[PDB]
Amino acid sequence: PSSSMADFRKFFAKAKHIVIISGAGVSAESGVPTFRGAGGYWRKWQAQDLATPLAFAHNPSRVWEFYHYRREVMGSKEPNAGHRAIAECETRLGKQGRRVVVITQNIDELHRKAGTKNLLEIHGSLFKTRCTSCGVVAENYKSPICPALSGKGAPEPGTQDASIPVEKLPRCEEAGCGGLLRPHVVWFGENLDPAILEEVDRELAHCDLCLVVGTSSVVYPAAMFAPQVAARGVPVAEFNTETTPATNRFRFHFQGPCGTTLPEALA
């Protein structure tokens, strides 16, 4: 792949429909750990061992402790230069009749906070619940989400489980339902929303430039989106602190923190 910023910017000048795919690396500079770097451990586990319906089936208190911790940490976090460059790019191009869409694997909502409008949150949101009984999806920013979680979620190895009885975890308040809530987050082994996937496929099929930013490109189906676009002959530029298994499929690779490279690229 080319590291020519000038060649990328020639495509960027002409592009009518840009898809920006992001992962946890785009939020690293807001002081939010990635999943596979740092930093990624919560007590003894990584996200892949907790973000699963089997963890939730057999220890919903532990899974809730993890998501609670993340919710409370994320409340104080701010968009960084990469999130702003992405939002500002969308705004500026929109006034020219040019489309920019963000397809994010992040559930942190920082793209929303940055000012991105055309946002596809393909793994859900830290700040939404879904009821395991009635299926209702609700926005939830309550701190703490339920009283039993107050002061819980401490991330240090050696921290004891809160072991909250299931009745005292977050419960559904729709129509007296009372059902156990889960995070409205896509877990390993679970299907992404088919309606979201249909929107993604239409953006990928019609875009004429693609950036893939801060993702390890190992989680599917997301990891195949930018390669799909590249394989149509459309230029794809990867922005990452390192190379990934997808790097060689792409037209461009810009190594470095995306809070530096994205403002330059999208200027």
Binding site: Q48, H123, G189, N191, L192, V218, V219, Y220, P221
Partner: peptide
């Protein structure tokens, strides 16, 4: 294809 996996 629609399942979150690694992949």
């Amino acid at each position: 294809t629609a399942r979150k996996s690694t992949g």
